[PDB]
Amino acid sequence: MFQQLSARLQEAIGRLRGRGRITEEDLKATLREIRRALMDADVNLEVARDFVERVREEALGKQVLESLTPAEVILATVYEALKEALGGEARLPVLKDRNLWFLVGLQGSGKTTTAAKLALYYKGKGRRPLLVAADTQRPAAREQLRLLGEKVGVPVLEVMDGESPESIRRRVEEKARLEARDLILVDTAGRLQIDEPLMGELARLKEVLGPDEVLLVLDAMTGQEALSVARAFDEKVGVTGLVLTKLDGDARGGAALSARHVTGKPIYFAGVSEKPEGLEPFYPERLAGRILGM
């Protein structure tokens, strides 16, 4: 994953391999290349500075200038730096008997596809999901989820035009109660940009529906710019976790590496394809190892 970054990080580190002990000027050259690699991957400035800082300082603390295999030392410290940036320990929502989740984000971020992906994911984990197309102004948006629900074999409750959050709540609670659905996935409305009035409806919907999780869906391809809306959603609504989509089309990885710093929210899942099966729980340690070709 993150082809360009993986290639560059590995190339930079390899310069310290197969040539005996290295000089600090040798180390500095590799450190500068790593820094350039991060900047080119669209990684947050502070994250990049911190990254290289600890790689250097940790390597030096591990007597890298005296090691007979210095590239292995740097690889290890680069792995720890990567792991930190990605989130440390993997995290996933803790499900209970009743689970109502909100999928929020701008249009095109991958909300509808992710809703279905999550339905299919938990469907095979002992859960009975219910998809809810909550756009009370755009019928076309609701239809999109309707078709997807069919493909994944998961029921889709469509809200009616202008339906009040109270009517939506009672209708969802009824369907879920009568059909034994323990995982409700609400696909909320979204525009190409943050809409104040729309954000007001969203907050009101949260108040009435009382979601257990509020997943902010982010298109990794938009770079670190994708994280700009995070603050707005958390203040007005309250984001509990993130979903990074289109990671299969992201060669940089800037959004994934910067999410932690900028948003302070954990990444629960990663979208790795346009297909309903293209969903994977976010694993910081696994991803760090992959990027470094481990």
Residues at the interface with Mg ion (CB under 5 A): 111-112
Considering only 44, 109, 240, 258, the residue that binds ligand GDP (CB under 6 A) is 109
Least Å from the CB of residue 111 to Mg ion = 5
Q: Give the number of other CB atoms < 10 A from CB of residue 288.
A: 21
What is the rounded CA–CA span in Å between residue 281 and residue 214?
16
| Residue 222 annotated as part of some ligand binding site | no
What is the rounded CA–CA span in Å between residue 175 and residue 189?
21
Pick from Mg ion, ligand GDP, none: which does 113 bind, CB < 5 to 8 A by kind?
ligand GDP
Pick from ligand GDP, Mg ion, none: which does 228 bind, CB < 5 to 8 A by kind?
none
**Residue 146 vs 236, nearer CB to Mg ion:** 146
Q: What is the amino acid identity at position 85?
A: A
| Residue 189 annotated as part of some ligand binding site | yes
Question: Are the C-beta atoms of residues 246 and 105 closer than 8 Å to each other?
Answer: no
Question: Are the C-beta atoms of residues 90 and 247 closer than 8 Å to each other?
Answer: no
Contacting ligand GDP within 207-246 (CB under 6 A): 245-246
Q: E strands within 41-115? A: 99-104
Considering only 8, 35, 56, 111, the residue that binds ligand GDP (CB under 6 A) is 111
User: Phi and psi dihedrals of 244, rounded to 5?
Assistant: -100, 110
Least Å from the CB of residue 251 to Mg ion = 25
The sheet that has 99-104: what strands, in order across it? 156-158, 129-133, 183-187, 99-104, 213-219, 241-245, 267-271, 279-281
How many residues bind ligand GDP (CB under 6 A)? The answer is 18
Residues making up the annotated binding site for GTP are 105-112, 187-191, 245-248
Positions touching ligand GDP (CB under 6 A) are 105, 107-113, 190, 245-246, 248-249, 271-274, 278
